[PDB]
Design a protein around this ligand. Structure first.
Ligand SMILES: [Zn+2]
Lengths: 298, 173, 208, 110
């Protein structure tokens, strides 16, 4: 039975809460299972606001080293990324939402907070790290999630991240590859400083029996939306912007060759591909359609 | 149509067969074929390579070079005068008739895009035909025509995915 | 249509020759009923064909197959029509032109419908879309009539192969792309395994 | 909850309600009356969880009222539903309905 996870054992939670394998090992939690609903609503919350970062709250539970996220919702706050802990404005709508939600079915407890990062990867800024450190300080099992809606679109797949911060004192172990994503230079500094102070979590996605069976029945009529998709005028103001970012990254490495952070043409080359790889992939689905619907004759 | 594949053969026999100097009829066709495919630079330096021996003996070759002068000068009525002059049958007379046709549609495709309005008499001589045949030839096309002033008014005239996937995989590495 | 081929098909079986000579003028001149698959293909009406009630029979074929140009050609061999029936034909005569040619110039619709001006044309086209026959819009300066969707009037068992062949070319097209993808997908992975293999040969040179 | 949903999605409006089970029935008509006190055009979705349909078991309805032999009374007129298109959302569907559970080794991209 797939619905092993949509079950919620409440007494098991409060035994782990008391036991605490997180006060013993600093990097205990390493995995993160994201539900069907949780993914959709978080992606929907990020894009709905769009250009502006907005954060909400996640609900979930713990199991082994996996911090499972079951359900999510929004926090009507402002100044995400510009304020350290911007959720303080609506302390009312955190507890008041879970008090209402527990009457109707959502028994799940506070598991974390998520925010959107439109057009610049998934990572924790210096403002985000100060939020999460103090979140872990008091309100324990709390995981900071990030999603990039504008690139999720252009890249053509779920652009998402799940992170946890380390203590101010103890410093991380060695094993860390960490994959590269284009960071706009305006932000590269902020990232660059506080980037090594935290560690990510291995993301995995699950679903129920009904969800799985519904999505299969849903696909009978959803193939139509795939071949009238067109990721061009949808996210037009990411690709047109990335150019502005790309231009600056070259401008630096050009003068770097001259008189005068290690070969910033190798980054810019990867960015020029990254951004254009998308632009080309876009025109694949376009010609695919011109082939299909236009070329039948009468 | 097939003059292309045949011109190739002439150019080869220039360096192929002879110790230096090619056949006199082979010179007569190489000059006229360069004019057919409007290559006046090639036609100019071909004429200067000919030895004075074949030049003087083969006086019909001069009649073909007299055509090339008018293409360089762009005296279009002069071209049609010099095409209707020397009968060099078998060898050159077939490619002389094709030469007059390529020069005609050049001067039509030219005049069409070079003139909003133009004199019928000039237009006639520029393409070669007389006043009537010129006035008629255009009225079939639907070109506007003007009496009194005699002014013709010209009307101006996987495959794809394979290419794309490469430009991805290239930039992708 | 749907209700008036159950109300008017219950009365198409239980009706003699003169009862159908009246009923043919009722079903035609009644907006909503633009389909004529059933009413023409009925044993009852087929006896009228080439009989004393032959004028009313030829008329049911025009609305269920032909166009307005055909009506004006057969103006005496058919019974005289009123404007409300002439309009319903002027709707269906475009629907045919619409299935073939999706971008229609204005002047076209003065010829196939024998109409006098845009004002009318438009008005008639208004009613066309208004009766839920067509979808689309117009382009006044450009003199156009784009047609986003049109219903199909005829069934045509005569030219059911003309429907089948157009379907095959799309089924072919489906394969054209499907296989066309799988080639390019297998090649984009092959060019990745081309480079990944060739980049292991570049690094192993350094071991010397 | 009308407070809290007006806070987060300030643009959004109240439209209707949902439930699970069979097709429309008396127990939902009584509930539809209680939603009719709140708004003048309440929509109604009903979902069959353990459906026998090979098609989707989610149908949308609305309130309609006619003379049932000298009796004005409420009914359900069924309506159809086109699916949503949002590009950001579409990927969410494409991710959970089609999961990369160890199904891509060499990047490939295409
Ligand atoms: Zn952030």
């Amino acid at each position: 039975s797939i619905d092993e996870i949509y079950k919620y054992d409440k007494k098991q939670q409060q035994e782990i809460l008391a036991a605490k394998p997180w006060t013993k090992d600093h990097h205990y939690f390493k995995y993160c299972k994201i539900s069907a609903l949780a993914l959709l609503k978080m992606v929907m919350h990020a894009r709905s606001g769009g250009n502006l970062e907005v954060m909400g709250l996640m609900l979930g539970k713990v199991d082994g080293e996996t911090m499972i996220i079951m359900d999510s919702f929004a926090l009507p706050v402002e100044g995400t990324e510009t304020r350290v802990n911007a959720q303080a404005a609506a302390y009312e709508y955190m507890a008041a939402y879970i008090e209402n939600a527990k009457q109707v079915g959502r028994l799940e407890n506070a598991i974390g907070w998520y925010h959107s990062h439109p057009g610049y990867g998934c990572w924790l800024s210096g403002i985000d790290v100060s939020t999460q450190m103090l979140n872990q300080q008091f309100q324990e099992p709390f995981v900071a999630v990030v999603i990039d809606p504008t690139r999720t679109i252009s890249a053509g797949k779920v652009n998402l991240g799940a992170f946890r911060t380390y203590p101010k004192g103890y410093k991380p172990p060695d094993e860390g590859p960490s994959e590269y994503q284009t960071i706009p230079l305006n932000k590269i500094e902020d990232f660059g400083v506080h980037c090594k102070q935290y560690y990510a979590l291995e993301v995995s996605y699950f679903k129920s029996s009904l969800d799985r069976k519904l999505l299969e029945l849903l696909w009978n009529k959803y193939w139509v939306n795939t071949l009238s998709s067109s990721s061009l005028l949808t996210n037009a103001d990411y690709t047109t912007g990335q150019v502005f970012d790309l231009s600056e990254k070259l401008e630096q490495s050009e003068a770097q060759l001259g008189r005068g952070s290690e070969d910033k043409l190798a980054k810019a080359t990867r960015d020029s591909c990254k951004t254009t790889i998308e632009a080309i992939h876009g025109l694949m689905s376009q010609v695919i359609k011109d082939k299909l619907f236009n070329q039948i004759n009468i | 149509f097939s003059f292309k594949k045949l011109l190739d053969q002439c150019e080869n026999q220039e360096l192929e067969a002879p110790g230096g100097i090619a056949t006199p009829p082979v010179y007569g066709q190489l000059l006229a074929l360069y004019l057919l495919h409007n290559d006046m630079n090639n036609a100019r330096y071909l004429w200067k390579r000919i030895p004075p021996a074949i030049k003087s003996a083969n006086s019909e070759l001069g009649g073909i070079w007299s055509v090339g002068q008018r293409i360089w000068q762009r005296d279009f009525p002069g071209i049609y005068t010099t095409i209707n002059a020397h009968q060099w049958s078998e060898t050159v007379q077939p490619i002389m008739e094709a030469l007059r046709d390529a020069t005609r549609r050049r001067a039509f495709a030219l005049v069409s895009q070079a003139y909003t309005s133009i004199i019928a008499d000039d237009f006639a001589a520029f393409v070669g035909l007389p006043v009537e045949e010129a006035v008629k030839g255009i009225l079939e096309q639907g070109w506007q025509a003007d009496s009194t002033t005699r002014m013709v008014l010209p009307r101006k005239p996987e495959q794809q995915l394979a290419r794309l996937t490469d430009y991805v995989a290239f930039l992708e590495n | 249509t749907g209700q008036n081929q159950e109300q008017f098909l219950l009365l198409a079986k239980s009706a003699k020759g003169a009862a159908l000579a009246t009923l043919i003028h009722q079903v035609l001149e009644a907006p909503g009923v633009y389909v004529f698959g059933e009413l023409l293909d009925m044993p009852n009406v087929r006896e009228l064909a080439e009989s004393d009630f032959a004028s009313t029979f030829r008329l049911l074929t025009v609305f269920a197959y032909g166009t307005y140009a055909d009506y004006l050609a057969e103006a005496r061999n058919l019974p005289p029509l009123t404007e409300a029936q002439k309009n319903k034909l002027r709707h269906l005569s475009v629907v045919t032109l619409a299935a073939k040619v999706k971008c229609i110039p204005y002047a076209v619709l003065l010829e196939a419908l024998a109409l006098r001006n845009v004002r009318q044309l438009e008005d008639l086209v208004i009613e066309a879309v208004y009766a839920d026959v067509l979808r689309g819009s117009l382009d006044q300066r450009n003199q156009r009539l784009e047609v986003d969707y049109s219903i199909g009037r005829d069934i045509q068992r005569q030219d059911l192969s003309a429907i089948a062949r157009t379907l095959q070319e799309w089924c072919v097209g489906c394969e054209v792309v499907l296989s066309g993808i799988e080639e390019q997908v297998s090649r984009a992975n092959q060019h990745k395994e081309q480079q990944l293999g060739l980049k292991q040969q570049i690094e192993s040179e350094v071991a010397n | 909850k009308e407070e809290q949903f007006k806070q987060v999605f300030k643009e959004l409006e109240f439209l209707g309600w949902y439930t699970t089970g069979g097709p429309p029935d008396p127990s939902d008509i009584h509930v539809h009356k209680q939603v009719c006190e709140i708004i003048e055009s309440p929509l109604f979705l009903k979902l069959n969880p353990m459906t026998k349909h090979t098609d989707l078991p989610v149908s949308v309805f609305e309130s309609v009222i006619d003379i049932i032999n000298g009796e004005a009374t409420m009914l359900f007129a069924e309506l159809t539903y086109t699916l949503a298109t949002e590009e950001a959302e579409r990927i969410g569907v494409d991710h959970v309905a089609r999961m990369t559970a160890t199904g891509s080794g060499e990047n490939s991209t295409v």
